[PDB]
Amino acid sequence: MQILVRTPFVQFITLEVEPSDTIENVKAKIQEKEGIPPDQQRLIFAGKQLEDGRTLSDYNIQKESTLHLVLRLRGX
Amino acid sequence: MQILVRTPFVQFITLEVEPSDTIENVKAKIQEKEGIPPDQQRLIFAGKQLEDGRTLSDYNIQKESTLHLVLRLRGX
Amino acid sequence: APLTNDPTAIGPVLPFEELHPRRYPENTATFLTRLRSLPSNHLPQPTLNCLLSAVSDQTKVSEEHLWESLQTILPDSQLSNEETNTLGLSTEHLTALAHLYNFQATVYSDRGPILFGPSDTIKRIDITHTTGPPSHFSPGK
Amino acid sequence: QLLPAPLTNDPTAIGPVLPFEELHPRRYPENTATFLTRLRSLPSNHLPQPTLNCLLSAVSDQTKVSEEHLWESLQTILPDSQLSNEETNTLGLSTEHLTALAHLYNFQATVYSDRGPILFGPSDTIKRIDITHTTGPPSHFSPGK
């Protein structure tokens, strides 16, 4: 037979951003890097889902901070 | 600045096994495919941790089933 | 938001994982919702029903029973709206279904596999997603 | 093993042998806290710090908490049989101790092992730390990526 094993390794993507960049700008950077449309992108920092019309400074996102990407797919 | 983004994508590992294979043998096949020592391997299927001295048939692991791998690192 | 004034909802707006605590994948159940107030209104099946069809194929549960179970857990404003009629159901509905039917779903998107649904479960299903456009859900991998 | 034998007759533990996530429910990464344990009964016996204490050193560097306080915190949550045993003396502390420390201090740790990054600790936390693990042998824990 043949079986699958789901490894516990996580994947990180490095982005260069400015404190005044909006969330929509951050999403468009992940589209150019990984090919994910901003429609199906949901970014979470500090347990709260980040809003598209806010900047990184509004969420107190410092340098080397880690954001979590969650896929919201629809459509058948 | 520069920030880090954690993607939700999952990595899978495919293994060629037989129903009579022991869990120790399964971990040995994962070492040969990824390079993880069997000591730091923990395999879970159907919510229960798989014991080394048991076989895939003991846990009723059919073909195309998926096992979850968890690493237990010491250190011186 | 429509669910703030949804007649079929009661209580404050809380994330799904707080209202229905399970071992969800991280931040996959943080979407805002409300507790259902009225029983099911028996909404018609969404025309774009490929998500229900894919879940039905994997779980051997009829699409009517899947859709009725959603109407017990989510308010109507999150079941039939502008997105539902134009784009179809979302993976958020998959998370609600996964809680209802105790399974974890693996979604093989165009960019890689992702997980939805509580991990403290036995049943496992596979869903394939294509960006398209338009996006489509199909059973299998 | 999957069940440390001295745990079943540990005088410092009470209750049944249950996975860590059932006795101390948090938003752990899947199956990272499923290791079997028991609830601590007696207060801390003030066990000496392990000789192989890189894990405490790595966590201390990242969290600015002295290794003494980290070690004392473990003695309140875990029984002695899982704090100083054969594997502790010869190999040192494990990531399961890191999960317990993460629960006690409310952080999630990213472990950069030799084959990829791995997460331990509840996700409903704010503090984030980075720990590097090397298989070796001998295995070593170090702060940073």
Numbering used by the authors:
A (entry chain D), B (entry chain B): 1 to 76
C (entry chain C): 734 to 874
D (entry chain A): 730 to 874
The authors write:
The tightest binding UbV (UbV3) was chosen for further study and was found to block both polyprotein cleavage and DUB activity of PRO in vitro. X-ray structures of UbV3 in isolation and bound to PRO reveal that the inhibitor exists as a dimer that binds two copies of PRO. UbV3 blocked polyprotein cleavage activity that is essential for TYMV replication, and also, DUB activity that usurps cellular Ub-dependent antiviral mechanisms.
After several failed attempts to crystallize the complex, we ultimately succeeded by covalently linking UbV3 to PRO by modifying the C-terminal glycines of UbV3 with 3-bromopropylamine as we have done previously to generate stable complexes of vDUBs bound to Ub. As verified below, the modification yielded covalent linkages between the C-termini of the monomers within UbV3 to the active site cysteines (C783) of bound copies of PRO, which enabled crystallization of the complex for structural analysis. The X-ray crystal structure of the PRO-UbV complex clearly revealed two copies of PRO bound to one UbV3 dimer. The C-terminal tail of each UbV3 monomer lies within the active site cleft of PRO, where the C-terminal propylamine is covalently linked to the sidechain of C783 of PRO as expected, and the interactions between the C-terminal tail of UbV3 (71LRLRG75) and PRO are consistent with how Ub binds the protease. Furthermore, the sidechains of L71 and L73 of UbV3 pack against a hydrophobic surface of PRO comprised of V840, I847, F849 and F870. The sidechain of UbV3 R6 forms a salt-bridge with the sidechain of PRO E759, whose active site binds to another UbV3 chain. The X-ray crystal structure of the covalently linked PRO-UbV3 complex agrees with the SAXS ab initio envelope model of the non-covalent complex, and this suggests that the binding conformation is not disturbed by the introduction of a covalent bond that was needed to crystallize the complex.
